[PDB]
Design a protein around this ligand. Sequence first.
Ligand SMILES: NC(=O)c1ccc[n+]([C@@H]2O[C@H](COP(=O)([O-])OP(=O)(O)OC[C@H]3O[C@@H](n4cnc5c(N)ncnc54)[C@H](O)[C@@H]3O)[C@@H](O)[C@H]2O)c1
Ligand SMILES: NC(=O)c1ccc[n+]([C@@H]2O[C@H](COP(=O)([O-])OP(=O)(O)OC[C@H]3O[C@@H](n4cnc5c(N)ncnc54)[C@H](O)[C@@H]3O)[C@@H](O)[C@H]2O)c1
Ligand SMILES: NC(=O)c1ccc[n+]([C@@H]2O[C@H](COP(=O)([O-])OP(=O)(O)OC[C@H]3O[C@@H](n4cnc5c(N)ncnc54)[C@H](O)[C@@H]3O)[C@@H](O)[C@H]2O)c1
Ligand SMILES: NC(=O)c1ccc[n+]([C@@H]2O[C@H](COP(=O)([O-])OP(=O)(O)OC[C@H]3O[C@@H](n4cnc5c(N)ncnc54)[C@H](O)[C@@H]3O)[C@@H](O)[C@H]2O)c1
Ligand SMILES: O[C@H]1[C@H](O)[C@@H](O)[C@H](O)[C@@H](O)[C@H]1O
Lengths: 367, 368, 368, 366
Amino acid sequence: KALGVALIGTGFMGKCHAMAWRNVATAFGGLPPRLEVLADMPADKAHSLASSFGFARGTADWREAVSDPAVDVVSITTPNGLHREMAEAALAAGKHVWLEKPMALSVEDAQAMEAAARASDRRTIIGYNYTRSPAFRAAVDLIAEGAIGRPIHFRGMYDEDYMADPDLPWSWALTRKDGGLGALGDLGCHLVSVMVSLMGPVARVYAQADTVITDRPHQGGTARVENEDQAQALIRFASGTSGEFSCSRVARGYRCRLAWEVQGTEGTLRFDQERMNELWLYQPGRPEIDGFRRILTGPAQPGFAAFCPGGGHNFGFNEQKVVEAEMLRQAIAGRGKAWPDFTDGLTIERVIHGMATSAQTGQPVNF
Amino acid sequence: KALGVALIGTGFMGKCHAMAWRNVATAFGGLPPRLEVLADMPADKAHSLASSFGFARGTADWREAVSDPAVDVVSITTPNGLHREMAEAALAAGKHVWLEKPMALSVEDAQAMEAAARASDRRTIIGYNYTRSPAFRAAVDLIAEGAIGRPIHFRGMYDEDYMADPDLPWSWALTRKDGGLGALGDLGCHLVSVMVSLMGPVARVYAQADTVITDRPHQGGTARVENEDQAQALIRFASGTSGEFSCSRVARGYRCRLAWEVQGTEGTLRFDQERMNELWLYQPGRPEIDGFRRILTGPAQPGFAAFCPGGGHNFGFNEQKVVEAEMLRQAIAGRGKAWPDFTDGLTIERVIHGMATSAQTGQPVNFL
Amino acid sequence: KALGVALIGTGFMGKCHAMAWRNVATAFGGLPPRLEVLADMPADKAHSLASSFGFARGTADWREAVSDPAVDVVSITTPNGLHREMAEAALAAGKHVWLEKPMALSVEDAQAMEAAARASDRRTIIGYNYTRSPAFRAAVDLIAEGAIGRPIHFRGMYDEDYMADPDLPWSWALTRKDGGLGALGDLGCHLVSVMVSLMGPVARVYAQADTVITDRPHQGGTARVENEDQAQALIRFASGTSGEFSCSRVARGYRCRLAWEVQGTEGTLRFDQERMNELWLYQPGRPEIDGFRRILTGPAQPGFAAFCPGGGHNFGFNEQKVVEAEMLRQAIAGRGKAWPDFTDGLTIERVIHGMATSAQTGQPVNFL
Amino acid sequence: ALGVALIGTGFMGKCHAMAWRNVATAFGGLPPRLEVLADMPADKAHSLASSFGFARGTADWREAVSDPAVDVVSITTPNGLHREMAEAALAAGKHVWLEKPMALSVEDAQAMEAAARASDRRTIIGYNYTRSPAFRAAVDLIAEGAIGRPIHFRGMYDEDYMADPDLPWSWALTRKDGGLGALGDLGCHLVSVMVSLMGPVARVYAQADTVITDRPHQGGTARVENEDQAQALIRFASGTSGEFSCSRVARGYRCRLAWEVQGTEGTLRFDQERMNELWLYQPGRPEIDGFRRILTGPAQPGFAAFCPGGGHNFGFNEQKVVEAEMLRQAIAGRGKAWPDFTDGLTIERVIHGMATSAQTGQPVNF
Ligand SMILES: NC(=O)c1ccc[n+]([C@@H]2O[C@H](COP(=O)([O-])OP(=O)(O)OC[C@H]3O[C@@H](n4cnc5c(N)ncnc54)[C@H](O)[C@@H]3O)[C@@H](O)[C@H]2O)c1
Ligand SMILES: NC(=O)c1ccc[n+]([C@@H]2O[C@H](COP(=O)([O-])OP(=O)(O)OC[C@H]3O[C@@H](n4cnc5c(N)ncnc54)[C@H](O)[C@@H]3O)[C@@H](O)[C@H]2O)c1
Ligand SMILES: NC(=O)c1ccc[n+]([C@@H]2O[C@H](COP(=O)([O-])OP(=O)(O)OC[C@H]3O[C@@H](n4cnc5c(N)ncnc54)[C@H](O)[C@@H]3O)[C@@H](O)[C@H]2O)c1
Ligand SMILES: NC(=O)c1ccc[n+]([C@@H]2O[C@H](COP(=O)([O-])OP(=O)(O)OC[C@H]3O[C@@H](n4cnc5c(N)ncnc54)[C@H](O)[C@@H]3O)[C@@H](O)[C@H]2O)c1
Ligand SMILES: O[C@H]1[C@H](O)[C@@H](O)[C@H](O)[C@@H](O)[C@H]1O
């Protein structure tokens, strides 16, 4: 009755998934998932990390992980370029899929995966972990309850500086063919996942983009950076409401600055992921005490009580992934819907690729 | 040789200008300006406020005030619809002009005022006071010294909520003919004054705008709000750099949130007017101590030492206006160039009206 | 009819007082005080600053300024060792007195000044300007209204780093005989003025102190620093409530960090002078929205509306002094009581000297 | 692999269980074997052993600490049970991870400290605020001379879990069954951080108050006997000054363990409610002079074991994974665990000395 887990990849997100699967029942109860197969290359690395992560075995063969009869669900955290192949193989093998963002490098690959998921009758979720913080889920509930009235404006950014150093070498990830989008693919899609959760679907974008560092060192020479370092867009939501949107991988001093704000007719909500335990809420008050409230994360907020009964004991980035694992567990058990599945994920892919198209063509793109 | 001052209006900016003229020599030295004539309506209020503001006389006739031979410079702090008439009369009478923003209701009006100012050979400055804080002036100098390398992105906002209450009555300020622009005219022009001082001139805008409260109480019933409560724009600068721009008069909880950020190849500068004594600077550092610095306003920043020798003694909004007065004083004496004059101001008017045009047409607007 | 003003000193506080006297009627109405006599040394400095500050004349003789028949009130902004002589002379000459903190070098000095003020029947106020911010005055009113219930704890600090550099030269301010207390005299008295305004009178202190830099450069040689660089104290108020208290002139990175909080049975108030426009208020709320409010200074808070009708337009350090001037004008006109007068100031002197005594002897000190 | 017994399943019980489950995931080596979980009643012990992934649940903690498959015992039970359970675990030849404070009295802590030395087993006490990357980074910066010589410490630990007068009385508010109040709940945490930054305490002078003196009990009222808040002036063995406070009645504060070290060449400042930020001032040229916001990332001790990217906030619970790893390494003879029962007993003497100073109105020397 325990869920059988396969994990492909052991990097930033691979180890994050491994830590989540290990403690999901500790936090939320029920049966601890069985950690069956860890796939990674080379073989000696898969064997070492399988042992320390507590997987029953490691293998250099990713298809072993998706085909084992003892596996019910596959975490896929490999580079963007093999997401489509591995996800479709896992669905064809009758496995549920936890796929790291983005879905694939192109809308066309994401469309094929979306059709494959519908055909499989298996649960899918995409790894948009910034939608899982108690603060973010609390903000969505406050908007649903009318805490800020009708939303009238969204302003969101996602700034990091991991590519700011012009000496960082060229890679496949910086080509259109093998890397897909740049900052829009790495960061933009995260901001879309948060933005559409707050404001509903996107109807129109008008975008601009820049490549700040256009060429990088490559094996004693240099190679051209083909995707964007930063992008900005004006949004019209299906509601008719306005939005401002940006992302950057060259914004010096920022490490995880996914920051957003919803302005409403009766209040304002504001958040910055670099301080993920604070949610700022303004509602009209009598003039003597009027001002924004600092809501510090605690057991009043979704998910937090599963990890800690004491408010102000800071919730961590990695615990977002434990919440994500639990949402997929509950969906597989038919006790909840996981968001976003491959259908809702395809919509997010269309928005970021539409922003890329808009920036290139100088035309607004409608959805 | 002391400057003779006429002040028209005694409200938010009228009292701000009066306080600035009274302490400009206290802060910066030289001779205190002579406070000659205060013009306001009705007469009884002009007489009352001339006495408490320390002007030699009050009048209900602004035309007599700008024509007084004892007057050298005119502060104009009246409503937007009166700027063109009063500025043109002041320049025609051979007076230097300190004009509140925005210049007028239309680009056509601003163009006529710009021509009148050049024809007069008198100094002009527009009341873009957010360019006068020690933090802002320190940021411009840091960019000039290459402290953040080459600017690659600007993001700016100016949020206030003074029109957020839907019960606030309709006024002539909310008509296009008598009010001109909405949030772009009240707040947007301030953000442009700061943005172009940091990033240089605007080449292109693509904008969106909304009226979120479309009808307000008027007499027994309601009247239509014709101008925007909020606007946002993507910017392309003449330098080729990108920008994000917004303003709002309905952003709940914000009172004076003119906030901006310049991202460069070698650092980032960030500022919020609601904490006008803090400038955030990131420059790459060794990993053990890497992070943004909180630069607290003190005497190392332009203008501050004229007000206080001790750092961290917070500089105030009103003291921006004393700095503005000193810059006009020095321009009149021929010891400095005042920014923005009516020529520089006209460019700012074209940008905010260009953003309004872009929002109306759904098309980008180019300036160069 | 207008108040005649003498100003002694033109430094940090001298120029602050001059700017306050120049705009007090601009802000609060009535007749602008007449700036009659400025005293400073040397004479040509007094003449130059009298001209730029708008005083009718300058003199190198402080006794000339306090004795002038056109003078009704004297601002005394000279070094601490001169306060007693100048305040007693001004009171003897029948002048009201605006005296900078601390009162003098000793409790004995303050007792003599307190007696002289009662005998003179003139108004006195001491320049505890941190009690004048809209945020501070709002906090006092909130406590009185029961906004935080029953106060149960005070914690206050006043950190600055103006003496943190060991190569900063020795001065006569660093002897006990000529300079009095160290950080307790420069900063401690400010924190006491705020603390007793929130919590009421002090009943008992137990204090510790240190001199961190005991020797400083003196004319190519070295000389001994005799007074404390930092001090900390536990407080019992007359109410029986507990307090924590500290001050430091060597706390690196702090410029004006007068910060306090009052914890109560139904809320908490917290403040930091380096962000003097923010007051933090916690009151119990429904769990979904529970948290501290950031109250941004605006016209709802005492004094602010006299300077600006727009909330979030930051009130400045110097404008605290315009409020202080207005409180003295109103006390002179018999329309308000100024705090603290020399009687209430003597109590503050007893508290800071009791803390110094406690730190010296390792024993608690009790008051009235 | 290490065999683990866990006693208790509450706030710290679940925290320890999550730590033992991911310590090898984060730091490598063999995952500890989760052998026995002890809790009452037996149905709760069985259901939580199942969800926590322990091989068996028992309502008898004594046979859990005696199990031959157990090498180390996590003790997360109420304060009054610490002495009995730690002494039994040491006597059975087990390593001990004990929650703070050690016990209700110095007498009890003295007995536990002797038992730990008499055994050749490792001990560590759950002072988990010493485990954050920001805190460990601050200790390293001080040792490296980044702020020169410490000249002042100011620390507080404010929470409001007892601030509401409506909150009912409990046995924890008696001296006999509860021991100390705010000093025992929060004060000992602040001491663990303070002595790690400044070195040992030489002297305290303290004040304490019970500000809500009676609470609802069985439709009547019962007396609160221990302190709601306490403050102390400190002298360290170094001669340096300190300020210290704790409170369980400080409205609006949830986990406000906040401290500051002022030095001859800079200042370090930290607030646990923003546990991923360390504020460092060092003198700079006037145009750029100011405090640096150091955001937690892989440059700080422990962080890289959890995440390769800076600014991905480290959490309260991950402090406990670091604590587990330090105990693992100490059991393997590859590091000393701090604080053991000897170093823990010093902390107990400091908080009990503060309580005595407040009661007698006299300084207490150590
Ligand atoms: N949700 C988030 O917060 C977040 C953050 C970063 C990464 N991601 C996504 O996670 C994915 C991984 O990124 P990362 O930073 O973890 O990268 P990484 O390079 O650290 O991880 C790649 C892992 O996949 C393994 N791998 C590569 N090719 C393989 C193959 N053919 N078969 C088996 N294993 C293979 C590698 O050995 C490594 O363990 C990407 O799709 C990325 O976009 C999302
Ligand atoms: N720079 C800034 O930060 C700032 C802030 C506020 C206003 N402003 C600008 O300054 C101007 C003043 O706005 P405000 O908020 O002070 O408005 P206000 O209503 O407070 O000021 C209007 C003043 O002008 C006087 N006045 C009106 N008509 C007059 C006439 N015909 N003759 C003489 N006096 C007349 C009024 O009696 C009043 O004293 C506007 O153009 C506004 O956009 C700028
Ligand atoms: N309230 C506050 O916030 C604050 C801040 C700073 C200083 N102060 C107080 O103000 C006083 C002045 O300190 P400061 O920082 O302005 O110092 P300063 O050195 O800047 O000012 C001293 C002034 O007094 C003048 N002076 C000195 N001896 C004189 C004499 N015999 N006759 C006439 N003029 C004489 C000097 O020429 C100078 O103008 C002190 O008592 C200090 O404690 C208070
Ligand atoms: N280090 C920290 O940050 C931190 C935080 C909270 C608590 N603590 C400490 O940890 C301890 C746990 O406190 P808590 O808040 O988790 O309390 P709690 O009530 O949540 O935990 C008590 C647990 O012990 C179990 N238990 C009680 N008596 C038992 C017995 N005789 N046999 C077996 N199991 C028994 C209970 O069933 C429960 O699971 C206390 O000593 C407290 O001081 C430390
Ligand atoms: O800001 C402080 C404070 O205002 C004191 O009154 C003064 O004595 C100090 O020198 C100054 O730095």
